């Protein structure tokens, strides 16, 4: 047992980014090039996971590039101390894992956040009414890691956590299921307000969501093959757009 314990372990442009975790089977990204303007909402569509997830992983700094560079808000994260840099960027995805704590504590993934800022963030992400109308308000324990909230209500919580973190750039994993009509519509409205003046990177798999994206990134074999931004996927002539 002691031996087992001892067993230890807003302007964006991509220029020629190469990465591989294995370095043997295949490069994860090969000569990737794309540019995201400040305030654009950008969807990445294309491959299953050979381009979208490796690009996102580089955005999340899960790996450094082998070649090229990745800039966030105009600054390369590769030329910054990684621990401060990557920690200073907030991403909120469609499906959120929440901690088994107070609403206030759930609204502290940024432990120095004030209660006023947390409640304000819940107002922005339209939860403050239900937050105040939660049984303990901000002190309501989200027992079972958030199971008294819906998936949508958890998504709202994640949105408030993003708003409180006041990110300059967003990275979004597209939902694999639907939510509601009022909730997907709200989520999209929140996305539209969030992406105003801010960078939104949507890792899209279905073309269903990204038909009203501000920008579309078309991926092929781990590379961006096309990049039509002004919502012209049909004009883009891409196969996922043609099937949509």
Work out the strand percent.
15-25%
Summarize the main sheet: 5 strands, mixed
Distance between the termini: 55 Å
Encode the helix/strand succession as letters. Answer: HEEEHEEHHHHHEHEEEHH
**What is the alpha-carbon Rg in Å?**
19 Å
Structure description:
About 30% of the residues lie in helices and about 20% in strands. Helix 5 (about 115-125) packs across helix 7 and helix 7 (about 150-165) packs parallel to helix 8. The protein is globular and about 50 Å long. The chain contains 10 helices and 9 strands. The strands form 2 sheets. It has a 5-stranded mixed sheet with strand order 6-7-3-8-9. The chain has a 4-stranded antiparallel sheet with strand order 2-1-4-5, covered by helices on one side. It is found in: Cell membrane. It comes from Cricetus cricetus.
